[PDB]
Write a protein that binds this ligand. Structure first.
Ligand SMILES: N#Cc1cc([N+](=O)[O-])ccc1O
Length: 250
């Protein structure tokens, strides 16, 4: 099917961490207004990652999803510290289409199945953070702090078996570098799963997205290259379409 461009917003206390360069916005740090604007210029989905302190986090994330769902019509995912079914459930019911889990899934893979049994596989996005270690792709948890010793290859297969709907494949080797998506890692994972693969980490220019889709990604997730306007969403989709990639032009 079509390839998808997904804008990722890191949020804290209801604000976009580090804001954006869209001077047309009344508040370029408002994640609702920014998300709405992205939906109007051709982003396919949104992804919110919350890093609010724990005393206010639960209510803060629920307020976010409720305000977002009112304003946008495209799918969105919420994540950041979702550790159990009840937390995932309250966020979906309040408006999110999908939840994104990582550390809690690795520690308890049945969490994937629990959420999927009530909300469907299509509501469960597993973020897999992976890095090369001694020549093998290994899975990392706790914001990259912990080498689990689980092979990427084995965790991909288990994630699909447990009922996840999509995988975000984040390359710790590329996060924050603007040097390109980790196409070798994407090509490594592609034959191991039938699920949609969302590339994350390393985006710096339009050609990087073409490369990631040639590697077999179904979607590409990007952050500051969009918010700081190093890449324009409408230029990006026109570029991808020109070179043969099936993207939706609204
Ligand atoms: N979506 C997302 C996302 C997830 C993680 N993460 O699961 O560490 C980090 C940054 C992100 O933008």
């Amino acid at each position: 099917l079509a390839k998808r461009i997904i804008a990722a917003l890191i949020v804290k206390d209801g604000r976009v961490v580090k804001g954006s360069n869209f001077e047309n916005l009344r508040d370029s740090g408002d994640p609702v207004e920014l998300g709405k604007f992205y939906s109007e210029i051709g982003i396919d989905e949104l992804s919110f990652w919350d890093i609010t302190a724990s005393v206010e986090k639960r209510k803060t994330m629920l307020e976010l999803v409720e305000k977002v769902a009112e304003q946008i019509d495209i799918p969105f995912t919420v994540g950041g510290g979702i550790h159990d079914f009840e937390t995932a459930s309250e966020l979906i019911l309040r408006g999110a289409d999908k939840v994104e889990i990582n550390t809690a899934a690795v520690e308890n893979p049945s969490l994937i199945t629990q959420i999927a049994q009530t909300f469907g596989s299509q509501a469960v996005v597993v973020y897999i953070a992976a890095k090369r270690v001694d020549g093998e792709f290994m899975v990392f948890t706790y914001s990259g702090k912990k080498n689990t010793g689980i092979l990427l290859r084995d965790w991909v297969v288990e994630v699909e078996k447990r009922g996840a709907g999509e995988i975000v494949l984040g390359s710790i080797d590329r996060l924050g570098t603007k040097s390109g998506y980790d196409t070798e890692m994407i090509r490594f994972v592609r034959p191991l799963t039938t699920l949609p693969i969302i590339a994350h980490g390393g985006a710096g220019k339009m050609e990087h997205f073409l490369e990631a889709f040639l590697a077999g990604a179904d979607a590409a997730k990007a952050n500051s290259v969009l918010h700081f306007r190093e890449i324009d969403v409408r230029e990006l989709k026109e570029y991808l379409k020109k070179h043969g990639v099936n993207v939706r032009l609204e």
